[PDB]
Amino acid sequence: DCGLRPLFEKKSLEDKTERELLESYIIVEGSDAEIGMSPWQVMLFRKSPQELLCGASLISDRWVLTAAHCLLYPPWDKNFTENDLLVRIGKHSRTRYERNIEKISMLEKIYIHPRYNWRENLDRDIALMKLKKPVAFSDYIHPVCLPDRETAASLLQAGYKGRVTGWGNLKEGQPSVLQVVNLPIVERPVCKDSTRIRITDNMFCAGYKPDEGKRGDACEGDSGGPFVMKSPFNNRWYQMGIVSWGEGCDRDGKYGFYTHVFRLKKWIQKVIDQFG
Amino acid sequence: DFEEIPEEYLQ
C-alpha cells in the first residue's frame, strides 16, 4: 500500500505542485505543506530538553528511516540512544501537540550502518529505528515506498525533480508548519565541482544552478528527512534519498547532498528481515 | 517553544 496517500492518490486529487515533478520527467525558499501531503514524514524528538532533532520517514508500521548523523556524530559529542528520544508521526505543526492526530512512539533499538563514515564525508549516512509497537495508519500516517532497481534507474536522472520536506530552519526562524520544496537532480560532474568534499557513489546532489533563476534547499533541522519522487508508471511515491549534508543552505553554486537509498537497500533489507 | 506532551510517553 506504500506511496499511495489517503488524502490524494486514493481520492484522485493531485497536490498543488506534483505536476511540476511529473513535467520534468521528459527548508529554504519552500512553501507551507498541505494537510496529508507527506504522511510518511516523521519528527525525531528529544525528551530532555524537548527539542526537534531531525526529520525521518515511516517505511512500515514498525520501522523508521533517518540519517545516521542525527544519532551519532562524535565531532559534536552526539551519541543519542533509545531512551533519549521519541518518534512523532502524523504531524503538520512543528511545536504543537496535535491531539488525536499525531502518534508518539518509543524505540526498541537503533541500527546504524556498520560502515557509516562520520570521520570524513558522511558516507553511508543512514540508520534504522525499530519502534516498540506498530503505529496504525490513518489519513495523516502512511508509509512511503523504497525503490526497486528499475524505478531508481528510470527516475534518478539529472534534470528530474524530487521533493524535500521538513521543519528545519527557513534561513541559514523555524516554520510554523511543515515546509516543502521541489528540486532538480544535478549532474554528478557539477556536484563534484562544487565542493572540496570527496563525493561517493552512495550520494547524489540536488538544487538549482545559479543561472536557472529558481532556488531552494534543505537546512539544519531537515536532516534525516526524505527526498521523494512520484513514479509516472504506477503513481506511487518512492523515497530516493535521505537529506544529508550541505555547506550552508541555499548558497549559490552549492547544492544539497543526499544519501542514495537504493545503493544501500540490501543493508536495509538485511537488518529488517534479521530483526523483524 | 514546543508544547508540553503527555507524560505517559515521557516515561
Ligand SMILES: Cc1ncn(CC(=O)NC(C)(C)C)c1CNC(=O)Cn1c(C)ccc(NS(=O)(=O)Cc2ccccc2)c1=O
Ligand atoms: C540538511 C542540511 N542541508 C544543509 N545543511 C548544513 C547546515 O544546516 N548548515 C548550517 C547549520 C551552518 C546552516 C544541512 C544539515 N546537515 C548537517 O548539519 C550535516 N553536516 C554535518 C554533520 C557536518 C558537516 C556538514 N557540512 S560541512 O561541514 O560544510 C561539510 C562536511 C560534510 C560532511 C562531513 C564533514 C563536513 C553538514 O551538513
